[PDB]
């Protein structure tokens, strides 16, 4: 299997721009930045609010907990090749503290709302308009050869007072490579496509189109997260109990998988369930019929059927978005 688009783009370009290994980092002055306040926490890292002591300015500063050289050199080098694209964090300066030497990443400031009281205020139209951002930086990196690989509300920022969004936590992005095959341990539970769920290495560009799918679906369903697996076998079930198991069956038989006996045993048989049947009185006011041909083009099992990001933008669904960009 191999991605339909962009396929070539780091075949094309000097081994430089994807060896991301062979890059060596030019640090700065640790005693510019300091600490304000903390805004957020995670299992790789803690972030702080802070200021640039030189020019008073505020900024992002990103902790890094004690991990892998690799992982570290990756998320800077996908971090440079993509700073100045639209919708993406950018990368200010990179230090580190002397005694222990723990990193630390320095950015661009960013405000932000948590998620769990700024989607139930969104209306109709702001979904629209944040969806088409994070498209956007979707096809950049794309385009530039590089998957994200976590998207999911936590690692999407917004400042709805500024309608500004932008695109974070590059921890697990990677580069594309026809035919490779990568690691399925990426992504939060709720938010993992089927390819990772039935073991699909060789997946590319498309990963993010199905998480970006979950996202979607949460939102005009109000229901947070929409697939709400316990472990990942649980995952699984729950997603066949809504596209049903014909349109699985099919799939593991075009790429030739088989589904060991305690997850296939699990899974059963299940006939597909409309899209219109999740629809009720806290959700009524997202859900259309636009916004249900978009969604059921997304969440496909078989990664080829699913849109681009590029086919995505110039969905119907995003017509009056383009609208008021074109003046
Ligand atoms: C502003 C903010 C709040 C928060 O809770 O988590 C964050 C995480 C960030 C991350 N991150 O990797 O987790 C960035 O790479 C950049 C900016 C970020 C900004 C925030």
Not at 36 to 45: A, E, F, N, Q, T
């Amino acid at each position: 299997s191999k991605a339909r688009v962009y396929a070539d783009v780091n075949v094309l370009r000097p081994k430089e721009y994807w060896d991301y290994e062979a890059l060596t980092v030019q640090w700065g002055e640790q005693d510019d930045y300091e600490v304000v306040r903390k805004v957020g926490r995670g299992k790789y890292s803690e972030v702080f609010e802070g200021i640039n002591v030189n020019n008073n300015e505020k900024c992002i500063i990103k902790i890094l907990k004690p991990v892998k050289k690799k992982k570290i050199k990756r998320e800077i080098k996908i971090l440079q090749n993509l700073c100045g694209g639209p919708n993406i964090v950018k990368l200010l300066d990179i230090v580190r503290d002397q005694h222990s030497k723990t990193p630390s990443l320095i950015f661009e400031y960013v405000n932000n709302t948590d998620f769990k009281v700024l989607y139930p205020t969104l209306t109709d139209y702001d979904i629209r308009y944040y969806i088409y951002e994070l498209l956007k930086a979707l096809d950049y990196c794309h385009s530039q050869g590089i998957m994200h690989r976590d998207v999911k509300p936590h690692n999407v920022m917004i400042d709805h007072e500024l309608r500004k969004l932008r695109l974070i936590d590059w921890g697990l992005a990677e580069f594309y490579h026809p035919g490779k095959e990568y690691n399925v341990r990426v992504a939060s539970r709720y938010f993992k496509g089927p390819e990772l769920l039935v073991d699909l290495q060789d997946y590319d560009y498309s990963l993010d189109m199905w998480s970006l799918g979950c996202m979607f679906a949460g939102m005009i369903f109000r229901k947070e997260p929409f697939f709400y697996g316990h472990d990942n076998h649980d995952q699984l079930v729950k997603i066949a109990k809504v596209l049903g198991t014909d349109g699985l069956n099919v799939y593991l038989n075009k790429y030739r998988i088989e589904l060991d006996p305690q997850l296939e045993a699990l899974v059963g048989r299940h006939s597909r369930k409309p899209w219109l049947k999740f629809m009720n009185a806290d959700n009524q006011h997202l859900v259309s019929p636009e916004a249900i041909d978009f969604l059921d083009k997304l969440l496909r099992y078989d990664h080829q059927e699913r849109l681009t990001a590029l086919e995505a933008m110039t969905h119907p669904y995003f017509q009056q978005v383009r609208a008021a960009e074109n003046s």
